[PDB]
Design a binder for this molecule. Sequence first.
Ligand SMILES: Nc1ccn([C@H]2C[C@H](O)[C@@H](COP(=O)(O)OP(=O)(O)OP(=O)(O)O)O2)c(=O)n1
Ligand SMILES: [Ca+2]
Ligand SMILES: [Ca+2]
Length: 426
Amino acid sequence: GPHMATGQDRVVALVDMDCFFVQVEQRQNPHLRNKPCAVVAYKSWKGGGIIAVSYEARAFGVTASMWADDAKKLCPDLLLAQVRESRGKANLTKYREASVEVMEIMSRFAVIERASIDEAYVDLTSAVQERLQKLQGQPISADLLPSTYIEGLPQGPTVQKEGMRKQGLFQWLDSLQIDNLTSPDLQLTVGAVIVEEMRAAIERETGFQCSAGISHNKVLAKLACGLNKPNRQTLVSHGSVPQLFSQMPIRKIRSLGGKLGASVIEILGIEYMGELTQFTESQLQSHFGEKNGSWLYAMCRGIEHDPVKPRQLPKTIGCSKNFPGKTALATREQVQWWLLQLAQELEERLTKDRNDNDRVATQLVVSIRVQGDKRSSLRRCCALTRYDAHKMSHDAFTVIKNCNTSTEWSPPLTMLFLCATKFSAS
DNA sequence: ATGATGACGCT
DNA sequence: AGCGTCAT
Ligand SMILES: Nc1ccn([C@H]2C[C@H](O)[C@@H](COP(=O)(O)OP(=O)(O)OP(=O)(O)O)O2)c(=O)n1
Ligand SMILES: [Ca+2]
Ligand SMILES: [Ca+2]
């Protein structure tokens, strides 16, 4: 139990666009539609680096971080769109703008947290209560959930994918107690009805398809989203967690895909998320720190309290370019010229941002990488007082020039990064 | 060695 | 403040 919390207090969705940069290019160029295709940055080196891949091309084994020339070996008919190039660098404006299209539609339904260029979390708790006030006690038909998967179902007593989806959904809805407006499962179900609507509106008004996850917190909603991609949505109930987590590799859960997840596996000698339940909160805290330990203890039971933050715009605006291998900047003149190119794109994006969103950045963060992967090697800041490219590139040079151990610059820089931050209204 | 981003934690 | 981790 009567005093044990179960993490069923919210309805949270994570919406993520399907092969996003590819859809943006396919909307614009109908020849690319329903074909194996990919988006590449640059062209000179091995046909360019693949940044995004349609599902038709994934069926040939093509992935991101492949060189286009190598992708062609797996998929000879592969079609390519390339990222716009401005001032000698890749420019993502087209995708940032398509992103705004989608975010503004989602923001009509509820408060969103912009999680990336093509993903947003939604807290649907209030919206769900609303929809439950209307539809006073009346059944939810499977027709309101035409693309929803219920994770863990069907169980017990078809041969095709859509057959299985529906069988599971029928089992789910048949068991659903609609007379209790406090039922966590009913609330998730209504949550999923709203997300069907949201996803319909996105596709109607933009042409873009997406997937979604619906559950009681962000981590489960994110996990749920990727269970049935593309163009589908997945409901992960509290009750589904023990079986789902029982064979779920630790690295699949958000924030456990890197070093901490590896420590968890190595120190505890476990593989799957469910196995974490057999450790006390104190043991987990002793191994991984108080915050991580408490987080892990709750999370392996499907419980997480990270709030959906009310934030629709990025908190930073940055411009970055890598200079790998022989292309690494070796002279002072090069460093200054590329700082200028970056500052000019940055100035362009800052002026737009100020006009649109009534805010101004006050700090300029300058970050470089040295040949050989020193320490980002180095990060320094200065005041951003004027949206002026020549001043910003000059200031950035001023704060990094001391790092030169040499007309010549050594060690060669393999990356430059300018980032505007610490925004104030207006 | 996708190269281009973005959010947040630690000290 | 500057570096590290984790992710799209
Ligand atoms: N390391 C990465 C990962 C992604 N992206 C870009 C290209 C993607 O189209 C977009 C969204 O990334 P996702 O990881 O969501 O991948 P997609 O949306 O392309 O595919 P999926 O349908 O698997 O989400 O961000 C990128 O530039 N660099
Ligand atoms: Ca995506
Ligand atoms: Ca994404």
